[PDB]
Every structure is written in C-alpha cells, then in structure tokens.
DNA sequence: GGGGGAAGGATTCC
DNA sequence: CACGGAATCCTTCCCCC
C-alpha cells in the first residue's frame, strides 16, 4: 500500500498573500487578538519571513511586535480559509477516492489503486502540486510512504513546498536513527516519560515490557509505538465527520460574577448554533478557562435533541455549577455541543 | 467480574 | 503567556446482571 499525504504551505498567511500579493515577501502574522488588553492575544501562524525570526503559533502577539516591530498583522479569519481549504479538498478527490481529512490543510489519499511503485507515486505527486497551485496559487508539501504515519512525517522534513519518499528500506533506517520526540502524536508531556523509560528512538519500544510501557504511556498510545516500532503499522484513510462544534471567548476582565459572564456565554451559544448549521446536538459542554490559563468543564447528555432555548437555560447552570466548584476567576468562557442524531 | 456509560480531564495538534 | 478549535484516549464513578 501507498500513501500521499498533503500539508498546505504556512495556510493561512499564504492565504493572505494569495488575497493580497502585496503581501509576498514581507513578514506577515496572522493574529488572533482576545480584545483584553491592545495587542493581547496569540499567533495562529504566520509566513516564513517572521518565522525565520521566532514569530510562530502560539507565542503571544506582544512578543512578536517586539522581534518584527514592522512585519504586517492581520487578524484570522478563518471563516475565509475555510472555503479556500474546502475547494482544495474537493480537488483532490479526483485523484483517489480514498481521502481521509485531518484538518484545515491536511489530507491522507491512498493511491494504491493509481500507482505501482513509488516512481509513479511521486511524479503523481507533483501532478497534483502543479494542479493546486495553479488552480488557488497555493503550494503545499507531499510526504509519501506505505502508512499515514511516515506519510506526514515524510512531508514533515520536505517543508517547506517540498515533496519527499520514504521507502522501506528508510523507513528501517528511521526507527532507529530518527528521534521518537518526532513522531506524530509524542507531544512534550509523552516524550519525556519515554525520555525515563529510557526510549530515545522509536525502535527502543522494544527494548521494555509492554506491561511497565503501558502503564507510563496508556494502552492505545503503547499499542501505537510499538506497532510503529515493529514496521507493522497499517492503519486504513477514513472520512472522519465532525463529532462536536463549539464556541469560547475571552472577557475584558476575569470575573465570577453570574451577569458579568453571561453575555459572553449566550454569545458563544448565539453563534454555536449557528455554525451548527441544521445539526441537533444532545450534549451540551461548558468550558471555562481560570485565571490561570487552566480549563474546567461540565456538561450533561439529554435523551433528546437541544433546542437552543433549552441550551441558555442548561448553560447557566453547568456555569453556576463551575464557580460554586473552582474558587479561581474565570477569564474566558465557551460552550461545546456534542452526540448530534 | 465485567459490560455499559457518562463526566471531567489529560494530551496532542492544527 | 496569550487564542481557538477539536479529536482521542484515560481515569473514575455509578447501575446492574
Ligand atoms: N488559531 C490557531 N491556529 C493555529 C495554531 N496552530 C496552528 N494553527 C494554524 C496554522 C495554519 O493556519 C493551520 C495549519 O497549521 P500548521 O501547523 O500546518 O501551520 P502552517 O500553515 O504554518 O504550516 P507550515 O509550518 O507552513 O507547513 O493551523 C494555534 O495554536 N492557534
Ligand atoms: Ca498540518
Ligand atoms: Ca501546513
Ligand atoms: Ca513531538
């Protein structure tokens, strides 16, 4: 078997730059500002300009100006790299029908029944690059190998607009030399319990008994590694469907007071079931996020579907439920609607 | 003993 | 920090055959 996997070049800001050419070039962050305090918020993503200076997801906008004091800040719409993404999927559907979504700028193909050999894997490859950036002007990076595992991570290395293969015979080579830090689905937390345990490279999982590897790392994520580790990974490309739709916000100012929440609150829920577009949720999820950038929620699972009358009422209560619970201010607040019929 | 869920949270990642 | 959004796995408790 044989995997493509797809990863769209720094998305959003090359969006940007799509929508703008002026744009290219220079350093362009797209930010998300939370309206608590000028310039308070994070960074989705941003081009390679600013990135080439530490300017990436996850730092907080103030921290860039610093480094990029210049460089162009747009706020995220989302909404509009949305579509933009949609259209692309769409595309590449008339290269396999096997293609699994893994988010916004992310797809799996399986193109066993296209291709023999990888030759034909990798020149189908640059077929559909061409296609792409021509059709929306986007480029994007192609990981090719037999799962969807060495897949991204082959597109991993060749980033950025690049394309890569990863035969057999490397993939050996990686289960030992490649750092297991790297491996999708090892993020800070994991990696360093396998740091103890001793497993620094991925075929090290082989070196403990399941039993002590398991109880460090659970079960489903020791299973993973191991089958990985053993070059017997084979997990099928599916269409995976939205399982919940939801909706947070930050306030201008920490708070526990019932009325100062609220409108926040019924905002998110006003909104979430609009995106719910005509889907019937029958769980409904409160989630709040202290004063200490922490996040506690409740929730409840109705027998029948949540109309949005019923949603305000329930909210409340999940909110009450959350203070009387945590002392702690909160600083934001959402919903989350879940079980949809 | 163990199936069956629900809920609250931990983890990873985009 | 300093934001949003979302899936999956995990621990835990609760009801019962
Ligand atoms: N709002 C928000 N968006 C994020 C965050 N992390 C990643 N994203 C965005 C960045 C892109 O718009 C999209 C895909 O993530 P990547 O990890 O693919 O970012 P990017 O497009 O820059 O990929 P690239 O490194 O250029 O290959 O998700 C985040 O923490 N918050
Ligand atoms: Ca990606
Ligand atoms: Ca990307
Ligand atoms: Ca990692």
């Known amino acids: 078997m044989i995997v493509l996997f797809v990863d769209f070049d720094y998305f959003y800001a090359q969006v940007e730059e799509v929508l703008n050419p002026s744009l290219k070039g220079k350093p362009v962050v797209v930010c998300v500002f939370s309206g608590r305090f000028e310039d308070s918020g994070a960074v989705?993503?941003?081009?390679?300009?600013?990135?080439?200076?530490?300017?990436?997801?996850?730092?907080?906008?103030?921290?860039?100006?610093?480094?990029?004091?210049?460089?162009?800040?747009?706020?995220?719409?989302?909404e509009v790299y949305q579509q933009v993404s949609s259209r692309i999927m769409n595309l590449l559907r008339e290269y396999s029908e096997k293609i699994e979504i893994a988010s916004i700028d992310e797809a799996y193909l399986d193109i066993s029944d296209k291709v023999r050999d990888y030759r034909e894997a990798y020149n189908l490859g640059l077929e559909i690059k061409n296609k792409i950036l021509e059709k929306e002007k986007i480029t994007v990076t192609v990981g090719i190998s037999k799962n969807k595992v060495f897949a991204k991570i082959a597109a991993d290395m060749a980033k950025p607009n690049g394309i890569k293969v990863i035969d057999d015979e490397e993939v050996k080579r990686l289960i030992r030399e490649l750092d297991i830090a790297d491996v999708p689905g090892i993020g800070n937390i994991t990696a360093e319990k396998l740091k103890k345990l001793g497993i620094n490279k991925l075929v090290d999982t082989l070196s403990i008994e399941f039993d002590k590897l398991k109880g460090m790392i659970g079960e489903a994520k020791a299973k993973y590694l191991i089958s990985l580790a053993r070059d017997e990974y084979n997990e099928p490309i599916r269409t995976r469907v939205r399982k919940s739709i939801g909706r947070i916000?930050?306030?201008?100012?920490?708070?526990?007071?019932?009325?100062?929440?609220?409108?926040?609150?019924?905002?998110?829920?006003?909104?979430?079931?609009?995106?719910?577009?005509?889907?019937?949720?029958?769980?409904?999820?409160?989630?709040?996020?202290?004063?200490?950038?922490?996040?506690?929620?409740?929730?409840?699972?109705?027998?029948?579907?949540?109309?949005?009358?019923?949603?305000?009422?329930?909210?409340?209560?999940?909110?009450?439920?959350?203070?009387?619970?945590?002392?702690?201010?909160?600083?934001?607040?959402?919903?989350?609607?879940?079980?949809?019929?």
């Open 249 to 341: 916000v930050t306030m201008k100012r920490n708070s526990r007071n019932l009325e100062e929440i609220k409108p926040y609150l019924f905002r998110a829920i006003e909104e979430s079931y609009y995106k719910l577009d005509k889907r019937i949720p029958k769980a409904i999820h409160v989630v709040a996020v202290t004063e200490d950038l922490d996040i506690v929620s409740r929730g409840r699972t109705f027998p029948h579907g949540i109309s949005k009358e019923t949603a305000y009422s329930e909210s409340v209560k999940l909110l009450q439920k959350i203070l009387e619970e945590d002392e702690r201010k909160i600083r934001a607040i959402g919903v989350r609607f879940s079980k949809f019929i």
């Open 44 to 78: 989705a993503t941003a081009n390679y300009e600013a990135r080439k200076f530490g300017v990436k997801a996850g730092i907080p906008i103030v921290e860039a100006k610093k480094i990029l004091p210049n460089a162009v800040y747009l706020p995220m719409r989302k």
